[PDB]
Design a protein around this ligand. Structure first.
Ligand SMILES: [Cl-]
Ligand SMILES: [Cl-]
Length: 162
């Protein structure tokens, strides 16, 4: 199992602009376009991204393309952040994929705010860190997702995802 698969499972694959959990204009596998309430903007943004006049529609190829750029960017972001790099580093392979998941979903900045959670993690304190994790808007907002990650963190296995 891997980040690409795991992520494609939480994100799904959409080929037409759509709105996400917050009503933001998105596309393909979790590729956020804009935070504006306007489609055009949104439309505008996809075109600039794919580099062509899409008219809010892309191919699977292209969707997987953004996904790569997106994954790649995420890892990199984690890698150049002083609150994550260390965490990342201390963690094992399965759990690293999890940091990635989260960053992906919420922004590096978003995730760098789980200070307490991040610490438990550093200390390799699974049960504690999972309890902490659950006390978030993130958790209350998109429950099923949180639960897979949180559970993966506690176990280190891809069960939740099997
Ligand atoms: Cl882009
Ligand atoms: Cl969910």
């Amino acid at each position: 199992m891997n980040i690409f698969e795991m992520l494609r499972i939480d994100e799904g694959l959409r080929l037409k602009i759509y709105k996400d959990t917050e009503g933001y204009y998105t596309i393909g596998i979790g590729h956020l376009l804009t935070k504006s309430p306007s489609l055009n903007a949104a439309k505008s943004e996809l075109d600039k991204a794919i580099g062509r006049n899409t008219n809010g529609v892309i191919t699977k190829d292209e969707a997987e393309k953004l996904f790569n750029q997106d994954v790649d960017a995420a890892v990199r972001g984690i890698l150049r952040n002083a609150k994550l790099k260390p965490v990342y580093d201390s963690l094992d392979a399965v759990r690293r994929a999890l940091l990635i998941n989260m960053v992906f979903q919420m922004g590096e900045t978003g995730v760098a705010g789980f200070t307490n959670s991040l610490r438990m993690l550093q200390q390799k304190r699974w049960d504690e860190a999972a309890v902490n994790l659950a006390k978030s808007r993130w958790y209350n907002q998109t429950p099923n997702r949180a639960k897979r990650v949180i559970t993966t963190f506690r176990t280190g296995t891809w069960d939740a995802y099997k």
